[PDB]
Design a protein around this ligand. Structure first.
Ligand SMILES: C[C@H]1CNC[C@H](CO)C1
Ligand SMILES: [Zn+2]
Ligand SMILES: [Zn+2]
Ligand SMILES: [Zn+2]
Ligand SMILES: [Zn+2]
Lengths: 69, 69
């Protein structure tokens, strides 16, 4: 039904929000510290000096294990 | 249709996976460091001395800003 299409769209958008903002291919699994922005996969987070969201210096990257992984 | 019920179940389970594993009421927004398990809201995370997934000591809690928030 049209309701099935609405639910498909909601699911698709939630799933896309869990993907890396740089490569758009891998799941987010890394946090920039200390700002806390958690928006990249490990590979894309590895060489950034500053956060791509807030420009704060990245002191280190914390790996995150999320139940949605 | 029956597919509407299946999609509602998939959406409900994905949303439940983003809720705190301890209180079941608030969104996950906190990481236990250094283990990386990201399974609690800020209120339950503040009250735990050991990670509820792996039992490692919590040195500190990092707030995470996720695009799914
Ligand atoms: C964003 C809320 C999540 N946990 C409850 C808190 C009450 O101030 C804040
Ligand atoms: Zn990436
Ligand atoms: Zn940031
Ligand atoms: Zn909680
Ligand atoms: Zn842990």
């Amino acid at each position: 039904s049209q309701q099935t299409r609405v639910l498909q769209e909601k699911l698709r958008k939630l799933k896309e929000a869990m993907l890396c903002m740089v490569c758009c291919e891998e799941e987010i699994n890394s946090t920039f510290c200390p700002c806390g922005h958690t928006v990249c996969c490990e590979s894309c987070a590895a060489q950034l000096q500053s956060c791509p969201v807030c420009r704060s210096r990245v002191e280190h990257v914390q790996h995150v294990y999320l139940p949605t992984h």
